Symmetry: C2
Subunit: 237 residues, 2 copies
């Protein structure tokens, strides 16, 4: 499986940030993806569109178009230059009450538009404390993933919302990998599984060396090229 | 009071739509101001073609924070830097689906001001609220809670959405105008009040000539220049 390093800028980035984005790209010139705010996507594509780095969005709506003030369609992301979109991030599941059925509908829209969906799952502190980690993941993986998923059209990120040790991560990733084989067979075994908890240059070697971790979904350490590229450099070792 | 015609494209518009946006701008290019609020993905490209023109450009929502760990959200600073001067906040499509409270709306308005945006704040009652004869009670609460201290005729515009006639509209807009004078004094009497129910070329003269109606927030009829410009033409008569 080809490793995949995804950065999520979250609610950071304007035209002033394009230099930094170029620096991330030039450091790549594994696969790498940066997911920028929707306001910046077209301008990011204008400078990076040819280059090695992949460009993504951070959420999309379930419909192709329509009366949804303040929402962005998968088609809008695609036309602005995204190839990938994060869907079901913990920051949204909570605040925007995105249920697994809502997440599945968003994934289906992403595919209609030709995007790869980077689907996030993960249990809360109360859920882990209740000894419900595998029950939550069983439900979220089933409900969030539409029928028709392939190793080409989805990538999964595990977020330990409750926080994680590399043993904790190994246990979860093995569980998720078995789930993908159970539902999607041999092709399911090729679905990339990213660790999406705290990933920093200081813990990247240990986390990315872990069985069934096929990359990372990196938040704050994706905002500066020096951090992001130092994490990417682990694959040299 | 100078009249103000705002179009809300909602979740419609890509690069392919830039010709139609230009057609709107050229049709405006004396007695009123015009604003088009495009999806966040399109804003920078809209500014690139229209930034030196008469049309105002806006966004459709913003977050409460300046920046931060808010996947899929757009800050007021991002809108401003991409070329917006205005932002729609508290539209009924979001108050319902995303449970945007009056407190949440207030915090968004405050962010808009920090970034130097004019906040186009939407209020309005549900069908159930209208059926229960609670319209004025709901507007009293929404107007108090949604507007921060510090509002001026320069930094806010209010749109009334009957979420649920000219007599209905005159009564409501009179009430809203009086509430603005009550809280903000003489300056409050200068806050523009837009009607934002179904505004079409066929009802525009009657609606826009109503006392205390200072313009409109137009949805579907803003998607095509022919419809939008026909509504604007009312100020020539």
């Amino acid at each position: 499986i080809r490793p995949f390093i995804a950065g999520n800028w979250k609610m950071n980035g304007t035209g002033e940030s394009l230099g930094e984005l170029r620096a991330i790209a030039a450091g790549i010139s594994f696969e790498a993806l940066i997911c920028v705010p929707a306001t910046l996507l077209s301008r990011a594509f204008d400078i990076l569109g040819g280059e090695n780095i992949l460009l993504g969005g951070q959420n999309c709506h379930f419909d192709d178009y329509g009366p949804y003030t303040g929402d962005i369609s998968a088609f809008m992301l695609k036309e602005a230059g995204a190839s990938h979109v994060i869907i079901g991030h913990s920051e949204r599941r909570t605040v925007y009450q995105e249920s697994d059925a809502i997440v599945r509908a968003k994934v289906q829209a992403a595919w209609r538009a030709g995007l790869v969906a980077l689907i996030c799952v993960g249990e809360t502190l109360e859920e882990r404390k209740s000894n419900k980690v595998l029950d939550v993941l069983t439900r979220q993986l089933e409900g969030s993933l539409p029928d028709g998923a392939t190793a080409e059209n989805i990538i999964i990120a595990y977020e330990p919302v409750w926080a994680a040790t590399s043993a904790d991560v190994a246990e979860v990733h093995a569980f998720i990998h078995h789930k993908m084989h159970s539902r999607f067979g041999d092709e399911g075994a090729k679905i990339r599984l990213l660790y999406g908890g705290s990933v920093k240059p200081s813990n990247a070697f240990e986390l990315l060396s872990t069985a069934h971790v096929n990359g990372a979904l990196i938040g704050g350490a994706s905002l500066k090229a020096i951090d992001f590229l130092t994490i990417c450099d682990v694959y040299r070792k």
